[PDB]
């Protein structure tokens, strides 16, 4: 008969902490995307945000193999006459280290209001200190 | 109690009289009366006459004590349109629609 | 309700030769 469909109101969202020190950028981002989409839960629903909240620390310590650290160019356009700007991985880390992780996770995630809601759960902090201790965010070994 | 009142075949256009009707929609009789009196529109007096007719009907043909009366349902509707031919340039002929509107005011105590 | 009897001749087309 009718297959089970998780109801958004009765969804249990847990808090996890993932360390970005000595971690491959893409391999961490894909795991974060899986956690956000809730593919690890037995009650996964494509049209419901059944994922969990993850707090990423030490984002500036994320490592990229090879020469990507110098030859990885994050382009973007401002929608203007010639507003195309290119920033290398080192420049992005120097300016703000959380944005590289945020962009990677956003690219991993699907597009749409549901994807934006899934991305909304991410809280990336450059340092090792977080202000979400009140939610009992037990660390995740990954 | 319905105590309906309407003025069919009104010259004013419905599109321009709905603006005045919305101002008094759902307000007390006295407030609507003064708003229509001090509104700077021909439709203002056009609908004030209908409101006066409705309140007089309530006074005479129905229960007295107009004090506890409210304009519950009021709506403006288009009416029959008269065709007029206006000469234009290059010998072209266009048709002018003299639009008329039907205005209905329903006042009830509750 | 008479259909427009006279219709002006179309504006000459721009030279496209």
């Amino acid at each position: 008969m009718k297959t089970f469909t998780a109801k958004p109101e009765t969804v249990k969202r847990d808090w996890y902490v993932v360390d970005a020190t000595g971690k491959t950028l893409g391999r961490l981002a894909t795991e974060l995307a899986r956690r956000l989409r809730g593919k690890h839960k037995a009650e996964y629903t494509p049209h419901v945000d059944t994922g969990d909240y993850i707090i990423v620390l030490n984002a500036d310590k994320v490592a990229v193999t090879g020469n990507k650290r110098t030859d990885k160019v994050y382009y973007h356009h401002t929608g203007h006459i010639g507003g195309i700007k290119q920033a290398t991985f080192e420049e992005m880390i120097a300016r703000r280290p959380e944005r590289v992780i945020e962009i990677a996770v956003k690219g991993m995630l699907p597009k749409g209001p549901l994807g934006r809601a899934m991305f909304r759960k991410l809280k990336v902090y450059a340092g090792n200190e977080h202000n979400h201790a009140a939610q009992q965010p037990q660390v995740l070994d990954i | 109690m319905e105590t309906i009142a309407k003025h069919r075949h009104a010259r004013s256009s419905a599109q321009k009289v709905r603006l005045v009707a919305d101002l008094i929609r759902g307000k007390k009789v006295s407030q609507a009366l003064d708003i229509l009196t001090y509104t700077n529109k021909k439709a203002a007096v056009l609908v004030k006459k209908v409101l006066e007719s409705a309140i007089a009907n309530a006074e005479h043909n129905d229960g007295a004590d107009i004090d506890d009366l409210k304009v519950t349902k009021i709506f403006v509707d288009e009416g029959p349109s008269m065709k007029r031919i206006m000469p234009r340039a290059k010998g072209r002929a266009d048709r002018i629609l003299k639009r008329t509107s039907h205005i209905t005011v329903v006042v009830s105590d509750r | 309700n008479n259909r427009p009897v006279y219709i002006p001749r179309p504006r000459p087309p721009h030279p496209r030769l």
Partner: protein, 56 residues
């Protein structure tokens, strides 16, 4: 200088939304005659600020 396609009643209503007027909501009662009049305007009978101003 002409429309490619007919706009819809939804867009028409959205455009007309801002055409609605606003009530004065500033009816002032004369101190002496106790008559309603526009603020900073003389009454119909010709009374303003209690004293008469039109003498007619």
């Amino acid at each position: 200088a002409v429309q490619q396609n007919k706009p819809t009643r939804s867009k028409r209503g959205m455009r007309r939304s801002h055409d609605a007027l606003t009530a004065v909501t500033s009816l002032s009662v004369d101190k002496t005659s106790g008559e309603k009049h526009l603020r900073h305007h003389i009454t119909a009978d010709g009374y303003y600020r209690g004293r008469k101003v039109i003498a007619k």
